């Protein structure tokens, strides 16, 4: 079936997530939110590009899926399989309902009907605020043209308006690149898995010493 995406496009209903009071709902056609090279070190991938919604609406998982697949297949096969880290920034937690009048042969019914209208779960979608990021990709600054088009190539699977935005920031973190590198000389950045931990001033002096040695090279 899959009645068209035009029926579910607008957020018409309070979020209806899969829950204890609502079970037996299908599975998101997108299970994979992180792909490309997801283990890459923070300093490896300075440049970041976003796919940002310009509209207040609902994105279906099946659409999210084909968008993800689309971006990747271009990005990899053009630049490289490991040349980027693509993250899907939205998770389809909203459960769509259908009534499903069609039952079994041989005839439809009269006149009831609308009676007992409440629907069974149909699909999933991710309700999206204006200016909410949909996709994020981090790569090396030399890959811009390839990354900027990768998301641009994926917008065509998305209902509504979305913009490709050049992120003034380092990688998938905060800290606009100078304010990042500023804390790189002070060695306040401890590489975690595919991310960093930052050195606070707020903690116990013992572990702060052990954790970030080169910050006090000294102070």
């Amino acid at each position: 079936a899959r009645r068209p995406a035009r029926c579910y496009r607008y957020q018409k209903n309070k979020p209806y997530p899969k829950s204890r009071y609502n079970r037996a709902v299908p599975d998101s056609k997108i299970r994979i939110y992180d792909l490309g090279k997801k283990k890459a070190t923070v300093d490896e991938f300075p440049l970041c590009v976003h796919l940002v919604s310009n509209e207040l609406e609902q994105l279906s998982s099946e659409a999210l899926e084909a968008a993800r697949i689309c971006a990747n297949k271009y990005m990899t096969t053009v630049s490289g399989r490991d040349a980027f880290h693509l993250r899907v920034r939205v998770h389809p937690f909203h459960v769509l309902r259908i009534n499903k009048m069609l039952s079994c042969a041989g005839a439809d019914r009269l006149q009831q009907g609308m009676r007992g209208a409440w629907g069974k779960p149909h699909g999933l979608a991710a309700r999206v605020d204006i200016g909410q990021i949909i996709f994020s990709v981090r790569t090396k600054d030399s890959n811009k043209d390839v990354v900027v088009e990768g998301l641009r190539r994926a917008r065509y699977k998305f209902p509504g308006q979305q913009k490709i935005i050049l992120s003034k920031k380092w990688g998938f973190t905060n800290l606009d690149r100078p304010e990042y590198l500023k804390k790189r000389e002070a060695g306040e950045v401890k590489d975690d898995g595919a991310f960093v931990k930052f050195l606070s001033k707020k903690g116990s002096l013992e572990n702060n010493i052990r954790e970030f040695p080169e910050y006090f090279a000294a102070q």
Partner: protein
Amino acid sequence: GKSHGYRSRTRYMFQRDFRKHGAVHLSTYLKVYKVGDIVDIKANGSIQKGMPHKFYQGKTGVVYNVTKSSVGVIINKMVGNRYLEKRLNLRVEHIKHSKCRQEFLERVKANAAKRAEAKAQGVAVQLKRQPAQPRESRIVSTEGNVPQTLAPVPYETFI
């Protein structure tokens, strides 16, 4: 079927506050209520006996009776167009001591003491309150503060 029983919809309402639970302290039991006292009504979930119906939560009335563990409070609720007279028998854990009138006494008492100042001097009284006023003319010094002039900021994306 619809469900209208006594405490329905009170879930969050009759909850005790985050990190306040268990036994109620002794200030509540150690308070004295005579007739005419104006009291605020707020139920307490820890005490099930003698607690207000959810309607009277937040309402304030004048106690008309004093019994062993409770005080009768007369309250005014509207039904149709009129106020009928409700009287509740409520325990002390559910009764506050209303600060609404308390200041009015501290107003009258200060009014009578400022009356003796027109008795011992003879100046004009100015007893009744007056609301906030248009303010007044003033002069703002440029000395050490010279107006710094701002423009509007352009548009730039922060993410």
